[PDB]
Design a protein around this ligand. Structure first.
Ligand code: AGS
Ligand code: MG
Length: 325
DNA sequence: TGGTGGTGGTGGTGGTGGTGGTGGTGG
């Protein structure tokens, strides 16, 4: 009755007096709580994510074995970010970026902030400082397996430092979660894989840096290499596979496959033809691919060349599949 | 055969009671 209304009013008034405006409000009328996303550059993955892109303000996680293609996909993301007009930062903790290849993929070197730190504490301080400013929209840490605590860099090569990196990461998560969301900035951790001894059942694969990062993420993705793409005998690229092993903004466990060629990277148009054929928009007959009663190409490669050479029909195919899916 | 009329402050004593746990790594 009226008593409850008065009690709620007084409580909310006191709260918002003590801690400021916006502290307590109904959920439906708050626009800060909405989810928004940006593209990963691959249609298959951007549909597997469900919401069409990676979430802004959150923490994403990517890991795989050696030569799986992590930095490549992250550079594609950063590329799409600038192309829409958004600043970016790239923290290379492993000291292994090569500016040229980045230029090849599409990132504007004149605008991509960069840093090669020497200790994990310095890296995460830089992350906090950049995020808190409201000036950097995308941040990337090249490998969480290289963020060494201070005490171990100055120690001997046999000094055990049990569990220090886990403590570092657990503190860092607590600190960042709030500022990332306040500023609307996306942070991507990239991780490696180490096997575990003593497992009696199940897989032995694990990632580095403790259990903290797993709880705090909204998205986690596997990435694996599954085959080679050949031109004649000459190897030209790699075939991949991805699983959304964790999700918090859409139904999880879907997949995505695509080609990485050593040139531009993600073969957008191969993916588009595959989607068109799968959703039955592009016609096919035996080994011959067709379109609206006209024969397109007698193979994947030639058909893709056809699509690339034919901007007029490619955009129709695109928008149709996009709107359908 | 007959009584008058009030002055002026001085010096401090004594101590109580502690609260709380972080973080795995390598075939
Ligand atoms: N500058 C380059 N030029 C040509 N091919 C490259 C170049 N850099 C990477 N590649 C290829 O892309 C694949 C490796 O992708 P990466 O970006 O290194 O992802 P990664 O899984 O982190 O591998 P790491 O960092 O060496 S463990 C390999 O097929 C490389 O041959
Ligand atoms: Mg890399």
């Amino acid at each position: 009755d009226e008593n409850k209304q008065k009690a709620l009013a007084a409580a909310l008034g006191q709260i918002e007096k003590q801690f400021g405006k916006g502290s307590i409000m109904r959920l439906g009328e708050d626009r800060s709580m909405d989810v928004e996303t940006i593209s990963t550059g691959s249609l298959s993955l951007d549909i597997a994510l469900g919401a069409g892109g990676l979430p802004m303000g959150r923490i994403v996680e990517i890991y795989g074995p050696e030569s799986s293609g992590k930095t490549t996909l992250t550079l594609q993301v950063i590329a799409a970010a600038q192309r829409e007009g958004k600043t970016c930062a790239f923290i290379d903790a492993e000291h292994a970026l090569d500016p040229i290849y980045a230029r090849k993929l599409g990132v504007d070197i004149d605008n991509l902030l960069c840093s090669q730190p020497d200790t994990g504490e310095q890296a995460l301080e830089i992350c906090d400082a950049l995020a808190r400013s409201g000036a950097v929209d995308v941040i990337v840490v090249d490998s969480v397996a290289a963020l060494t605590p201070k005490a171990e860099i100055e120690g001997e090569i046999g000094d055990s430092h049990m569990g220090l990196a886990a403590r570092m990461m657990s503190q860092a998560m607590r600190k960042l979660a709030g500022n990332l969301k306040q500023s609307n900035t996306l942070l991507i951790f990239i991780n490696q894989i180490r096997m575990k001894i003593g497992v009696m059942f199940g897989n032995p694969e694990t990632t580095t840096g403790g259990n903290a990062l797993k709880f705090y993420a909204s998205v986690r993705l596997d990435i694996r290499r599954i085959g080679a793409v050949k031109e004649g005998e000459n190897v030209v690229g790699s075939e991949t596979r991805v699983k959304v092993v964790k999700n918090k903004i859409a139904a999880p466990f879907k997949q995505a496959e695509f080609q990485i060629l050593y040139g531009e990277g993600i073969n957008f148009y191969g993916e588009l033809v595959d989607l068109g054929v799968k959703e039955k928009l592009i016609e096919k007959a035996g080994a011959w691919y067709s379109y609206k009663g006209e024969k397109i190409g007698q193979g994947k490669a030639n058909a893709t060349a056809w699509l690339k050479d034919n901007p007029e029909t490619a955009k129709e195919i695109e928008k149709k599949v996009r709107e359908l899916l």
